[PDB]
């Protein structure tokens, strides 16, 4: 009963967050085994960030130029290297709370939880999606860089995002844990802008299935459609094409509700053409595209994690 | 930059969740010091829940009728007592991960995070508000009872909610940690219904301040109003009266944005009378009332917790 934007429990990630200080700049780091991962612009001054040469700036720093704070314990940095846009600091102590973990790169349309942190301390948790233009609609303030995005699979934390910057229009950009940016952005304070966004069509349909599961079923019609006919209508409204892979992804929701994917596509097509006529779906006046089909299954079937 | 429904980090609460089994019924429990708190209907069968006599059912059970599972460790129950609608189980081992904590009863309009759990394992976290009709719009499945709501103050976990039931229209009802229900509901499977809900007016204004902070300021007009004039309009739209205490609560947001509370009240009054004219605020087509003024300050100023 009910449906909300639900984040993964964050305790496993909380035990990995540390504060990284380089001179006067401070931000968050991820402590896994004996390595701390953090954005490379921790080594920049405010002036440096306008046009930085990270390799040149890292040259002039030794291990003693970095201070890592984990709770009330300072960790000695005994090595450092740069991998793309993330800095890796080897420390003399391995994190005893290191969970089983993996570094992944997610695709546009997939969701993850964000643990927003400041000065190495967790502050809040929320759910986000990687937009088709490779931004995320996050909530970050100054000092939030180093905050990570993740998904939990039973006992394994899949880290997929580290926060680096906010763009015009207030959207956010970052890297995977190997330091490669999502999208064409660079970690320099210069004018950059994301491309036009798109509505994640498969996520809307998953959200529509969630509405039916919770008894909100006014938008269901008696029609069907073909994948070609639906996609032609969707493109005119800046909706992404629905592929056969997306249909297969939606299979579990079709089986639970007894509504064929193409029948639900007929309902969405009507909603796109005629609007919602002043009605709401799951309490929302706009169609929602930041729930993946697995999010709907997990929330409407109750998968737990240890 | 940006604004989301943000939950508190849940790690402190995750270390307190256990599985409570009584015969065939299973649900979640809260393990603090050497006591486990859980809903009292764990001692019911499916038939019992239709019209239970909890005192009579508890009579016929000893400490050995309860099995508490904390991870891979079973805890021996060495005592049990009933306090209102919560059952308290004394165990032979105190929780070493017991955080500093307090039991509070919240007021309608205040928010809290929910750690949804099943079989004692955390599954997801989301933010909720206590509605004026003393329900919450949660997301719960079968076996979710014992899940708790909480707020974090630095290092202290303030527990304010334990989940017990879902009502018609899909809203949820529960108790404080002393077992007293929020609202007139009872833990019996019989037809019950919540009163008419109301829009938390002070929370809407706080959310409007969050919009201005994030540059979304089309709804600001050049007018002011009196508290009496605004409240008269608000009542016709099922909005709660705005008191002087609510105005004082809003003070920090007025100081940060430089917009007087009554000037923002003039904007809300116009929105209520004329609608939104097809526009959105913070990406929403409806006014949002589940952010308290402190939530806005915390998210737009970045308070952390250890
Ligand atoms: C990390 N601690 C911050 C988080 C920012 C700060 C406010 N909201 C956020 O998400 N990251 C930065 O300050 C990054 C970083 C330099 C500058 N920066 C920016 O986000 C800037 N944005 C851009 O330059 C633009 F236009 F490309 F988006 C800023 C103007 C300061 C908001 C580096 C190294 C890119
Ligand atoms: C705790 N594990 C469950 C959580 C429920 C189950 C589905 N969604 C939820 O939130 N709590 C219950 O099953 C409680 C509990 C008996 C029955 N119950 C209900 O929520 C029932 N609701 C009502 O009887 C009514 F109308 F008052 F809301 C049910 C019809 C089973 C949904 C007790 C002891 C009240």
From Swiss-Prot, chains A, B:
Effect in UniProt of substituting residue 49 to A: Does not affect ability to cleave and inactivate human TRMT1
Task of the protein: Cleaves the C-terminus of replicase polyprotein at 11 sites. Recognizes substrates containing the core sequence [ILMVF]-Q-|-[SGACN]. Cleaves and inactivates human TRMT1, preventing tRNA guanine(26)-dimethylation of tRNAs. May cleave human NLRP1 in lung epithelial cells, thereby activating the NLRP1 inflammasome pathway. May cleave human GSDMD, triggering alternative GSDME-mediated epithelial cell death upon activation of the NLRP1 inflammasome, which may enhance the release interleukins 1B, 6, 16 and 18. Also able to bind an ADP-ribose-1''-phosphate (ADRP).
Impact when changing residue 142 to A: Does not affect ability to cleave and inactivate human TRMT1
Organism: Severe acute respiratory syndrome coronavirus 2 (2019-nCoV)
Activity control, per UniProt: Inhibited by pyridone-containing alpha-ketoamides compounds 13a and 13b. In turn, alpha-ketoamide 13b (tert-butyl (1-((S)-1-(((S)-4-(benzylamino)-3,4-dioxo-1-((S)-2-oxopyrrolidin-3-yl)butan-2-yl)amino)-3-cyclopropyl-1-oxopropan-2-yl)-2-oxo-1,2-dihydropyridin-3-yl)carbamate) inhibits SARS-CoV-2 replication in human lung cells. Inhibited ex vivo by michael acceptor inhibitor N3. Inhibited ex vivo by compound 11a and 11b.
Annotated phenotype, changing residue 205 to V: In strain: Zeta/P.2
Name of the protein described by the UniProt record: 3C-like proteinase nsp5
UniProt domain Peptidase C30: residue ranges: 1-306
Highest taxon above the source species: Viruses
């Amino acid at each position: 009963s009910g449906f909300r934007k639900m984040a993964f429990p964050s305790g496993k990630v909380e035990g990995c967050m540390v504060q990284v200080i380089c001179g006067t700049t401070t931000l968050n780091g991820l402590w896994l085994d004996d390595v701390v991962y953090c954005p490379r612009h921790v080594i920049c001054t405010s002036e440096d960030m306008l046009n930085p040469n990270y390799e040149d700036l890292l040259i002039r720093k030794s291990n003693h130029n970095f201070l890592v704070q984990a709770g009330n314990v300072q960790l000695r940095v005994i090595g450092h290297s740069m991998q793309n846009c993330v800095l890796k600091l080897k420390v003399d102590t391995a994190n005893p709370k290191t969970p089983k973990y993996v570094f992944v790169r997610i695709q546009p349309g997939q969701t993850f939880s964000v643990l927003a942190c400041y000065n190495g301390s967790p502050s809040g948790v929320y759910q986000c999606a990687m937009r088709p233009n490779f931004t995320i609609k996050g909530s970050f303030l100054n000092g939030s860089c180093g905050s990570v995005g993740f998904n939990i699979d039973y006992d394994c934390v899949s880290f997929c995002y580290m926060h680096h910057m906010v763009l015009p229009t207030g959207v956010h950009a970052g890297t995977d844990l190997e330091g490669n940016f999502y999208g064409p952005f660079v970690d320099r304070q210069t004018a950059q802008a994301a491309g036009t966004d798109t509505t994640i069509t498969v996520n809307v349909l998953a959200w529509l299935y969630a509405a039916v599961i919770n008894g909100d079923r006014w938008f269901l019609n008696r029609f069907t459609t073909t994948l070609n006919d639906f996609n032609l209508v969707a493109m005119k409204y800046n909706y992404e094409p629905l592929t056969q892979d997306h249909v297969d992804i939606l299979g579990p929701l079709s089986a639970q509700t007894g509504i064929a994917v193409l029948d639900m596509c007929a309902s969405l097509k009507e909603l796109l053409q005629n609007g919602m006529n002043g009605r709401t779906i799951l309490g929302s006046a706009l169609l929602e595209d930041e729930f993946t089909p697995f999010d709907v299954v997990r929330q409407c079937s109750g998968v737990t994690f240890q």
